[PDB]
Amino acid sequence: CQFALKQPQEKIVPYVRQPEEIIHGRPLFFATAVTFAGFGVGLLVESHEGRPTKIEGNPDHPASLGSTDLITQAMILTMYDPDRSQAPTNAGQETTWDAFVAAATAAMQAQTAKQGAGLRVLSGSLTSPTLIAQKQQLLTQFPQAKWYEYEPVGRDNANAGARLAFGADVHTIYRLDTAKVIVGFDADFTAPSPTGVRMARQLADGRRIRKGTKEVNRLYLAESTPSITGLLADHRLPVRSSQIEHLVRALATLVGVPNVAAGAPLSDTEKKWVEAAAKDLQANRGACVVLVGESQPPVVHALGHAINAQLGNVGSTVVYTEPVEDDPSGGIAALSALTQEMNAGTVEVLLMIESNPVYNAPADIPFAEALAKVPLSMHVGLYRDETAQQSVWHINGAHFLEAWGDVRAFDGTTTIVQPLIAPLYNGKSAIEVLNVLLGKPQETGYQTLTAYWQTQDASGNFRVFWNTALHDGVITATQARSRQVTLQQGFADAAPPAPTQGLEIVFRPDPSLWDGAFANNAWLQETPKPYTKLTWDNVALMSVRTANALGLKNGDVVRLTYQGRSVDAPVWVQPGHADDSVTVHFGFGRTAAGRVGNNVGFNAYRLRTSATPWFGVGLEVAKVGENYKLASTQGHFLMEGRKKDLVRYGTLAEYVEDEKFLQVEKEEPISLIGEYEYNGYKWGMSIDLNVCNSCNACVVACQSENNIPVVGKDEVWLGREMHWIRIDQYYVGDEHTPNVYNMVMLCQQCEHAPCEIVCPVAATVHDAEGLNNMVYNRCVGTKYCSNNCPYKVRRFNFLQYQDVPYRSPIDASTENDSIPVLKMMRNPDVTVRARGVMEKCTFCVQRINEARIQARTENRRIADGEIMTACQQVCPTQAIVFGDLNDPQARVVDLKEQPLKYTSLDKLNTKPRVSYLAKIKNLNPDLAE
Amino acid sequence: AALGLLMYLFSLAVLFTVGVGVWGINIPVAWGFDIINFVWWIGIGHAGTLISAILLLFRQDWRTSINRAAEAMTIFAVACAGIYPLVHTGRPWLDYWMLPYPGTLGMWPQFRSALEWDVFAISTYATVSILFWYLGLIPDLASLRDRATNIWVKRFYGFLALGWRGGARDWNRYEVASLILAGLSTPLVLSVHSIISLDFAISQLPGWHVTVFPPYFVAGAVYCGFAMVILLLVPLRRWYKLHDLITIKHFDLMGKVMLAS
Amino acid sequence: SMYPVTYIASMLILTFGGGIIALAVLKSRNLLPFGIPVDRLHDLGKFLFAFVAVWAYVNFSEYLIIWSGNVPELTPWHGHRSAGGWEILGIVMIFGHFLLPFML
Amino acid sequence: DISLYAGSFGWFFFLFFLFIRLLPAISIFEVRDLVHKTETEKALA
Amino acid sequence: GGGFNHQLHVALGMDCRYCHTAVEVSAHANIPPTETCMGCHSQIISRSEKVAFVWQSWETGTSIQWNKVHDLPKFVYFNHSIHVAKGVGCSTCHGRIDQMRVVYKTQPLFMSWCLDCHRNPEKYVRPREEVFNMAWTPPPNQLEVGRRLVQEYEIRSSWELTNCAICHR
Amino acid sequence: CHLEMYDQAKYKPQQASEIFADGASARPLVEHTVARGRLRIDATSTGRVDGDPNGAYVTTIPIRITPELLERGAQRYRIYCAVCHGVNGNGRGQVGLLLNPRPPSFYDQRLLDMPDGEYYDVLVNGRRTMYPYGYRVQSISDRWAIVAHIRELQKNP
Ligand code: HEC
Ligand code: HEC
Ligand code: HEC
Ligand code: HEC
Ligand code: HEC
Ligand code: HEC
Ligand SMILES: CCCCCCCCCCCCCCCCCC(=O)OC[C@H](C)OC(=O)CCCCCCCCCCCCCCCCC
Ligand code: SF4
């Protein structure tokens, strides 16, 4: 309880030399990009003065068409993490940066005496052309130096399948805008992948269902575990993850592949799925695609290129370009070829660009014991990772908002990573650390970036070319050239072995925490996982029929014993799952993540075996626990007959006969309160629930925009998560093969808002614009608004929820004292809320007002695209559409007169401003029985 | 009771310091023991004024000896109650914002919420409970003053009772200010625990939006309340020898009204 | 709910109102076997007054709940009874039924 | 939530036991009228 | 140390957007950086101790810790440049700053004040050409001129202007 | 009295910081970064022929000269530039009599044979003892409007 008669003397400081570009109070968006796996996502990040506070999508970029992922959006709390490495560290104790360049250059003259032998580098799968040119300068200065590229969710099997079918390595850019059916095969392509935002928009562009739409996408999936593409899949099949090599061998023989050598037969529901998915592939040959993700072996990846070359997709929707990444034939096998080189000496310098392989290595690859045999182990990462303690040297990371850099996206388009801010802690990025190893330690990150692009610009007037590349983000004088391929024959001749009986393990990246590189990010942790709405826990995902054979409920801790290792995993049962196919997720069990990701789940990387790195069948469950915490944030995953109010679901077979078949043509409701007249800037929202894949990028972008506090695991289990927007799975149907439906439930901004009439101090009123104003400074904390809110989209600050993964919220010793580096990530237009006030989705009223007030100074009206909320500017599928309702030529006034426009809880006369477009899941005639 | 009060004042000193979220209230169910016990304590003191006010309309004489053990039992079930609308708020230092006062903000309370009327009901219920029990103690503490024979306890009851003397010009003015007060506290407590009943029934919730909440809550207030007067007066006959004033016909009639409620 | 209770509080108005009307014609025609005690007619007037106030507490809180949360399965009653001339009988029920026999 | 409710009976019986000791638990002047009412109805015989 | 004296500097013919630029562009009025104050004091009164605090903040890099006198709370979100674009001059919110040796508060920055001015803007709205004129006094005929300026500047009604999304985001 | 959200855990446009060497949360931009709304490479955004660093001083204004831009630049001259260059451009402002290298009067032959883009370049980057403007003007439509005013102010001696 802070208390004073006056607020203290607030100092206002100007600059000392104010730069020309900065106007105090204006957002000043900068066009950068983020190296996610090795590829760029393409960003438009908002730097108010120097500090970037909100990552948005670069609409010029090919990967993100103006909308980012869940992980890509929450790179701001990773930037302003107080657990970031604030100083370099030599053998445990802190040090300077120039002590490193006196120790590294003293070890670089000892390597030139040899042929640069012990100079192994362990970067992760980089595509950026400046670090490729610095590597190719490093590997021509030191001849016998090796560059190994380890990535745990790398495209190892995806490139080994491109070698096994085409000869050389080829990059495969799929194109779903000309695609009628998308027969995936263990391919979560709408996930946080290097192309996950474009493959989600192109998949959702095909199924924008309007007044005159008769043909949409189909999306046969056959997924191991329920993955977020399965929300958009209309024929998702729970396959055991070991039969997907045999579903493709049953589908490559229905289409024309001569040497498929099919084996290991199918079940009666996997065979009638594959005789109908391939029947819809033999038709519409020009617009169809067979997808396969890196969970699969390299043979089926080669068969996925065999089917796509049989159906004539090459040149139409599956283009083949030169490989954008530098070393495509190096993955887990490149990490295993390094530790067998790291053993018994014969390595002297080991640079480790941000990989964290002490934590990420498979159990068959002894990277822990092979490390500390290197006399000089250097590590470059923005966290003191699991490796940085076990490394001799350690450098800061220079997170991409702090560092001058490049990155190449898929399609080959290079985008320059400008620093929006100077390095808070002197970061010294990967382009600046190789400058020390090459011999140019005083050369900055900008001096070696323009030194490369001056030589890769064959046009004159480089300053026009360079300033345009920083402005637009993209370059597009550098796209990957389309490669003519062969599709060699005789690659799947060897018959597969017997399908081994036994309970299967399935390795996955968590959609929140991909490979544990961002496990210290608080926004990604408390963001609910897509199907199983959990926050701070790795789980073992079982089917309802698998757990019934083993006899374990939704909270027991089991000791998953793989080939030699046990992991002591909790259990979350899951209806969409495959039989005997227990799924564990990466990204957890970090022992040196920081204060957010330390000991949150079980480390699934201790079960990888580097020969079965994604799935294996030798698992023993052996329950050893009971009643784990498992802080979930949904309460009931089962639509309880509340259809017509949550997710109205239909098929396209019944929509082509009746347009408004999910609407209820009912009489106008009677209200005794009358109504009000909204005549200027009527704000409404249309959420297309048919295209929402539950990517949770809108949950974490409301968090980054509206200063929403993270809440720890102990207070999520009490149902006190602060999330203004939530996605609701609902699991309609059979408990073994259900349909999972998303309802993006935010504050519906009800016109006859029942949450407002129950506010004693009137801390919740309306605009004349029409949206619901939750004023935080007036809230005395009587949680009656939350009780009368029928959707329960009100979210109360219970404790002082502020910097909660860095100080536990059950104290008042640091209640009114805040972390100084976390204050820069906050939006300066949203109230950072106190201990006892309630929150609510305010339609991003700080984005409404900042363009309503700006349109009043220049005497005009707001257009449609001038106001774009944070959940709308992030949705890769563009499910959310915000806009004026009194503007007749608007985009939301079209989407709210569609025959699928329904409002949630119209049984109550709340009259919401948020209407939902209903879900239509395009069932085949040969499979709907 | 001091160890209960030091459990009361420590749970409140915890509640203000760390927050309102040491209770266990979730975001679905955001009203819990702070409101279940608040409507319970408000419910207890209501039959303490059926005994004090509603039965005085009926000119009934069995309410006479049950009077002060129900007038005072109302007040202490309101002082225990009325803290709960002041401490269940997350920012309890601004519960004056629920009062219609003029400020340098142009803001006033809402006066459509049934928790703002809870301010208006209880701060009328708390003040006329202590004005109808103090008016009843004006002619009674004049009798404890004259039976004192000790001037420092005579001056205590000679100032609590303002100087009363009896008198027909004061006795007639007493009962025409008592039965009007007993006629003003009878639509009050049928309204107070109806107004502590509207702050569920105003809300659109399925178990809350029923319209027989206003007479069924006040029925449960004169059900739970008569149970507390019975639970308190059975140990006030066996411990203070009041077998000739709290005779068992008073429990035969307090049981009939508790049954009829 | 409360819709039979609004009748129950008016069954008390009618039969205490019929209590005083029947003891008036039987008094005015000099047919009562007992002269009415003037203290116990103040009891019948206490009952007539305290059941006008009960009736206007169960009919108004029936309206106060339905008007506050305007659910469309509860508002059609008071929406048909406060529109098209039935609004006039609503204002009568506050003033001519409660407030004119509240003051007198 | 338990310690505030179980602590609330302290503040009830802190003030109730202050009421029993300092103030009369039975309204003396009204039960004096009840004793007078029993005598004035026995004298009506 | 030897702080800013507005009375001397506005007397030098500085039209109030010389320093405090983007009071007609931005939501927040600028306080000028040391580059503004050293634009003259590099040779006007260089080697003085009244402006030694601005030379020390130029030789070093420390920003001048000015004291904010109008410290509105951070739940208010005042927006400058909607008032100078809808015709509200720098007087009647800040006092006669040109007659101010050291800037004090004139208005207490209440909520009821600025609600009486949002509910009735016609008793305070001046023309846009006299917004940055500090000597502008309200006329005896403020009404029927201020009401004329409200319908000219399309100034919204008292309903839309007081609903705490104006303020209080 | 209760200060709960009076001062918050975020930074305003010009409030102090407890993190950096300077006290400012307003942090400097990296010197060769380009924002999205401001490409700043044309012959309009710099006062040169094709946006070269050592360009060739574009001799007339590229943007148009409307009567509401001459009136805007007459307003924007009187705010910024007329303090120590005089209202009529004679270098006779109240501070211009006290600057040691006296502000050159416009109407001098050199300032008349001066190219129009150099009048932009003395604005946005500053001359020797005249510190840079352009962070005070902050808009290309008013930097050229100021020198549109001076070119019309160079016709009435
Ligand atoms: C003429 C255009 C004006 C100039 C020049 C300045 N103001 Fe204002 N002002 C007003 C309020 C309510 C505040 C506090 C707002 C907050 O703290 O967020 C201010 C503040 C300033 C500041 C301080 C900002 C800083 O310290 O950098 C400056 C420099 C300033 N003002 C200059 C109110 C008003 C107002 C009423 C609507 C108007 C017309 C003006 N201010 C005008 C000017
Ligand atoms: C040119 C337009 C100026 C700008 C920009 C600033 N100042 Fe100034 N200042 C200027 C003059 C011509 C004078 C008079 C010199 C004298 O000896 O009187 C001043 C004076 C001051 C003073 C001293 C006031 C006094 O002695 O009465 C101070 C403290 C001062 N100036 C501060 C100051 C600051 C902080 C500035 C940056 C915003 C600034 N001045 C700018 C001319 C100009
Ligand atoms: C540069 C020479 C300025 C001119 C022209 C104007 N102002 Fe100013 N202002 C200047 C400085 C260096 C400061 C900070 C010093 C201080 O005493 O605060 C200010 C401050 C203000 C303030 C107070 C802001 C606050 O601290 O809350 C106000 C209200 C203000 N200035 C108003 C104002 C007006 C109305 C002007 C036109 C006459 C004006 N300023 C011109 C520098 C300069
Ligand atoms: C007081 C702070 C000034 C302001 C306001 C403006 N100028 Fe200026 N200017 C100033 C000085 C002290 C000088 C002398 C430079 C020298 O080294 O002697 C100048 C000079 C110029 C020139 C001449 C350039 C030259 O002769 O090499 C020009 C063309 C000029 N200034 C333009 C100019 C404009 C467009 C202004 C408004 C933004 C302006 N000046 C304002 C001092 C000051
Ligand atoms: C702009 C005209 C405003 C409107 C539309 C609203 N408020 Fe309001 N408020 C405003 C200002 C300038 C202040 C600061 C006043 C001060 O410094 O004391 C405030 C403050 C408040 C408070 C005080 C908070 C506290 O003291 O802790 C409250 C409770 C408040 N404002 C509430 C409020 C409500 C409910 C509104 C509903 C439409 C509202 N405000 C509008 C300016 C404005
Ligand atoms: C001191 C606290 C204060 C705050 C905070 C404040 N005002 Fe305003 N305000 C106006 C006028 C006139 C408008 C323009 C209304 C419009 O354009 O719709 C306005 C508009 C606004 C807007 C912009 C509304 C929008 O549509 O973006 C905000 C924000 C605002 N005022 C906040 C006159 C005033 C006056 C009158 C002298 C006072 C004082 C005043 N305002 C004081 C304040
Ligand atoms: C349990 C109680 C409630 C009972 C149930 C409800 C029944 C109705 C109650 C009606 C009366 C309620 C009064 C509420 C006053 C609220 C004022 C307030 O809390 O200001 C707080 C603020 C921080 O403080 C300030 O801004 C200024 C602080 C300093 C002023 C101190 C004023 C204290 C008043 C006593 C004055 C005595 C003289 C002291 C003078 C000041 C010396 C410092
Ligand atoms: S949807 Fe819920 S939070 Fe939003 S206005 Fe309606 S009741 Fe309030």
Ligand code: SF4
């Ligand atoms: S529109 Fe509302 S729910 Fe969506 S991101 Fe913005 S604040 Fe959150």
Ligand code: SF4
């Ligand atoms: S609304 Fe958009 S961002 Fe949110 S879950 Fe759906 S697709 Fe993802």
Ligand code: F3S
């Ligand atoms: S009803 Fe009112 S004051 Fe606070 S939490 Fe709910 S808003």
